[PDB]
Amino acid sequence: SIAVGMIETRGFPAVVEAADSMVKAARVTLVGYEKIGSGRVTVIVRGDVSEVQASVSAGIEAANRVNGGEVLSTHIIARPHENLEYVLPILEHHH
């Protein structure tokens, strides 16, 4: 199935590293970037579930190594419900 994978960091450089490592690690596309305040930012990828699993693992490993990198929360959703797309910005850049 298609899945989305999410890494939320405290800090911008770490979220950029999470995104870069995710898209380089597996066949996924970066589709979202969400800011919710308090320094919390999330990047969202989409692809086949196994690919998303590989990408999220790579992104966590990489973001942890950033100078001042802080990973706050991570999650994968297989088969996200279609209602989510038009309410939550998880798929903003998916076409």
Place this chain on the structure above:
Amino acid sequence: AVGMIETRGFPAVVEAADSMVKAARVTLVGYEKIGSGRVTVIVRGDVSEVQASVSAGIEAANRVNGGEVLSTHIIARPHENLEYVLPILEHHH
């Protein structure tokens, strides 16, 4: 009825929303950000469906790595004045 789950953190709120819409016959109608990392998702449906959905959404958001549920509430017959002031029904048509 309207059901609301507020989390600290975005991944947890997404999981709350996904689990809510998959658990019962409810529509996700709102997403509100108020700072301090606090985000709320809002669903609408028959009260029994909303009750089922919110329970499922809490259970799922609690299991998210770094998931933090902050507040949850169900309102059965929300007053019509709320619709056009508060973004609880943004995507209800």
Place this chain on the structure above:
Amino acid sequence: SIAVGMIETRGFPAVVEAADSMVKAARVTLVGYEKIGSGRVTVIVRGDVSEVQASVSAGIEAANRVNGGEVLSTHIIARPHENLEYVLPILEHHH
């Protein structure tokens, strides 16, 4: 006199419950919703002063019972000065 009543909560679900309970408790209209950050949100009602007093009391009681509900500050202003309307968003939805 006409008054405005305000309940500020930390958290969105509690502010929605405050608003709902306020408009159901008395002859008031919900006229404002203000976000100032740090999780602080305020709802504002308008009506005859005695009605606003009843509504604010009901809203506090209800918002306190919300799971994770936190009431931060509450206040009633009788006869708000007309200068306030066009500077502060207390009466946004009053027509």
Place this chain on the structure above:
Amino acid sequence: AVGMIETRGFPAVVEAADSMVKAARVTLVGYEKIGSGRVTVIVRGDVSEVQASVSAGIEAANRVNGGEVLSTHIIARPHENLEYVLPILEHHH
């Protein structure tokens, strides 16, 4: 002159503004949000009126349930360069 009261919390800032405009001959000209729950209201008038207004506004905002006054200041003859950079005079016409 310009007089400013900054509070933590919205209800308290509204009460500061109301009490200021009712206490003396000043006009409420600004409302500024800067995060951390900090909000400022700004009035303009003759300096003696502004002084009276700010004193009344502090006394009233202190009495608000959960009211928190954070900072207050009066500037008598603010430099004209400030007008078009800082939102101290947004509603002054």
Place this chain on the structure above:
Amino acid sequence: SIAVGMIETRGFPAVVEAADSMVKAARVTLVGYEKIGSGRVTVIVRGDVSEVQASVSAGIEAANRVNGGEVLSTHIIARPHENLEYVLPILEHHH
């Protein structure tokens, strides 16, 4: 040389006093006002370096005397690189 001078405060009244005292103290113009959250606000002046030094010293002294005034950070840059102007809002009101 032309320089920019910056005073960042926690709180709005103190930043207004910093700006006023800066423009009154020396031959500088107020050219920027930046908000970055958490109550942190910065005002930016421009002028000859010696004038900017005098202005920043005056602004610090004044902002420290504000009731609830908190100066967080201050800095002067002589000859700011031209790349900065169109990325960072340090010179928004310089014409």
Place this chain on the structure above:
Amino acid sequence: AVGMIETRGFPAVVEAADSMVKAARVTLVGYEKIGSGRVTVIVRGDVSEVQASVSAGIEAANRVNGGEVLSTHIIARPHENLEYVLPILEHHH
């Protein structure tokens, strides 16, 4: 390559940016605000230039009165997908 310095505080981020562009052949291409007083500046250039620039920017931002460097990172060959999702290259033409 892309180089990033994130500070707590605006004056420090400006000094990081100025020192970076003056230290080597890099262009300042981004400025991102994410709350909690955290701001990041982003430069682009050949990796060796970026390395020189980030080192200079850290050293300078550390010396700012009330300067606080929070996080720094260099990415050598950022993936093209990042460009149109993240504001790392806003001013790169």
